[PDB]
């Protein structure tokens, strides 16, 4: 039914690249930051600052981790409840490169969401929420094990979006310096990029207060993927085919009611992505996989 | 009739303390006494809490114990009791050779009562949380910097390994100091796991809390480097000793047992515990 329109997709890539230098904006690099440089936050008051230490700099890549990288079929996996029961895991995993959002869980869910991960996003506040600030031996071990399971994937850490990341960022940095060379995970650390990314989408008449992580990943993926397939983008509380109630996340327990805690216009994002699907720019999966 | 110093009895106390506690060593970790990546535990929290020593933390440690071979005649140890308000003890405190203060307590607006001389002040890392907004803004960073600058060459004695609640803020503090290396004259000191060692002297004096206070820890340190110790601001009650009218807990707003023993030591002439207006 859906048919890829490569030429229209590549036009979109070029338009994105006119506003966002994706390869550079993907991560700060060692030679682009000074020790002691003061960072501000994309989404908080200008008064919040964060000084880049020697140790932080030592974790930056030398070159962009996506410099001269090319993947034919990419999956970008959002976290919608539409994925529960979809059995999309095999198809997702056939992709050359899989992007995941907010360190989402795969363990109990691989039949639906897959096991392949080539990039996952990681707000430093994950450490506060799920790893008790790496205070104890058990917390440190649990975090280490989570990282080891990612193997050589990219861990894409936006430490300069929300000022609430600041104190936990030092804990994350210190963990990684301490464990230097024990993990194969590739660290990537975007700087202040959301002004650039917002400019592309504003011209397409999408101007929320904040773009979602999913659409940010689409944006990055456009530069290095030949063809993008979206899964788990469905910001609604019912299944479009069966009409059954859905939770917000695929990992929510069965029966959880749909709720949004927004700063996002997800339905506005979805509408535009769905238009793009119709134009053949990208494939939005909204049904069980075959 | 007046308190009189009993120098013989104090010299016996100093010797007993030294025979139970290596004060010069316990005073601070040093660069060569820790290894990068060593896991520290906390004296007063469960064993499960750990903090890994970084290159940067190690870089802030002194090479040699800052109190090695130091000897001062008259020391004041100033606790933070409200009993100091209206005491007019500032001049007498400041006449001391060396003044120890507690928890970075303010002096500027209180100098008539508490003095302005400071040679050592302690600093629980949580001070950053409570008074400096975790150094989140330029204004906070500037305010902390200015506070530090006013200490000039005094020791800042930072116990980061007593309470596990110090862990996250300690990295903020370390990063601040590394970022400002060479801009401040303050001398940093970082005691390690010392409370079990300090405790051993005080346990024999039948002082038996779970945790000894900063004030009595300061007395212990002071015994090694002072000829004579005078205490101010030790009065752990919300009420005036003479009048029983409300008194704030701090002049700038376990302990009763510590106070009782310090009072006994005063009576023995080991130390002078001031509880009244100074002349
Ligand atoms: C890059 O991928 C394209 C597209 O592959 C197809 O669509 C994918 C989503 C997935 O379903 C694939 O298995 C499909 O083959 C490749 O183009 C196809 O190449 C095959 C085999 O050579 C050919 O029979 C098809 O006609 C082509 N399909 C289209 C739409 O062109 C392309 O070969 C891939 N290139 C590399 C180097 O991997
Ligand atoms: N029902 C849902 C839930 C999520 N998403 C998409 O999947 C991404 C990842 O979801 P989630 O981890 O829940 O992100 P949020 O917590 O919604 O927040 P943010 O986008 O700010 O990271 C979102 O950015 C959004 O694009 C969606 O389309 N429909
Ligand atoms: N009313 C008071 C207040 C303080 N103190 C003494 O002054 C020291 C410093 O006081 P404070 O800054 O209040 O210490 P705390 O923060 O209460 O806790 P800690 O004693 O653990 O530093 C205390 O250790 C205590 O010995 C006192 O005797 N009477
Ligand atoms: C792929 O998409 C492009 C871009 O929209 C299509 O090219 C357009 O075709 C429409 C419909 O006839 C024309 O009105 C436009 O003028 C064309 N624009 C450009 C820039 O070429 C193209 O038809 C699509 N391909 C397929 C197979 O649908
Ligand atoms: C993100 O990419 C943008 C370009 O889209 C970068 O902005 C450009 O940076 C160079 C400085 O070397 C200037 O020559 C251009 O004028 C800038 N363009 C615009 C539109 O401002 C930006 O530096 C990148 N940011 C990061 C953190 O990588
Ligand atoms: C994307 O990540 C996956 C792992 O999630 C990589 O696939 C693994 O590759 C290793 C090393 O060759 C194999 O031993 C594993 O069996 C593979 N696992 C899975 C789940 O497929 C894959 O190479 C990565 N792709 C890149 C980097 O392009
Ligand atoms: C100074 O303190 C010492 C030590 O406590 C006092 O000497 C003791 O005095 C008592 C009472 O006379 C004797 O029973 C002990 O045998 C003494 N011990 C020693 C080691 O001398 C001394 O009297 C104090 N000086 C005063 C009160 O002026
Ligand atoms: C504080 O001083 C005490 C000695 O009073 C040190 O305790 C000794 O530590 C060594 C090495 O850990 C042990 O082998 C000895 O048995 C200990 N002696 C005693 C009497 O317990 C302690 O290491 C010092 N701690 C710090 C952090 O300086
Ligand atoms: C104890 O600390 C005080 C500072 O609080 C030192 O006194 C200062 O000494 C400097 C340098 O000579 C003078 O410029 C200041 O006027 C003095 N200030 C005060 C308040 O007296 C004092 O030297 C220190 N004592 C020791 C023994 O280190
Ligand atoms: C020490 O202080 C005492 C008490 O005022 C004084 O008598 C003595 O001369 C001082 N100086 C020295 C070097 O002992």
XYZ file of C-alpha atoms in Angstrom, chain A residues 38 47-49 51 54-55 133 135-137 140 166-167 170-171 174 178, chain B residues 39 48-50 52 55-56 134 136-138 141 167-168 171-172 175 179:
36
model
C 30.069 27.665 30.378
C 20.492 32.138 34.419
C 21.245 28.320 34.744
C 24.770 27.446 33.696
C 30.875 24.552 33.470
C 38.339 18.355 32.000
C 36.621 15.083 32.700
C 21.944 8.667 41.734
C 24.736 6.082 45.410
C 25.201 2.396 46.214
C 27.178 -0.543 44.925
C 26.298 1.276 40.203
C 23.012 19.737 36.071
C 23.899 17.975 39.334
C 28.456 15.381 37.242
C 27.560 11.961 38.693
C 32.314 10.750 36.999
C 35.815 5.872 36.467
C 35.668 3.567 46.932
C 26.216 0.090 50.813
C 26.823 3.905 50.084
C 30.070 4.536 48.257
C 34.613 6.856 44.033
C 41.511 12.476 39.740
C 39.972 15.859 40.413
C 23.918 24.062 44.166
C 23.372 26.535 39.494
C 23.575 30.183 38.428
C 26.276 32.736 37.762
C 28.822 30.811 41.768
C 27.714 12.494 47.777
C 26.096 14.322 44.900
C 31.021 16.482 42.991
C 29.632 20.023 42.533
C 34.266 20.734 40.207
C 37.560 25.216 37.902
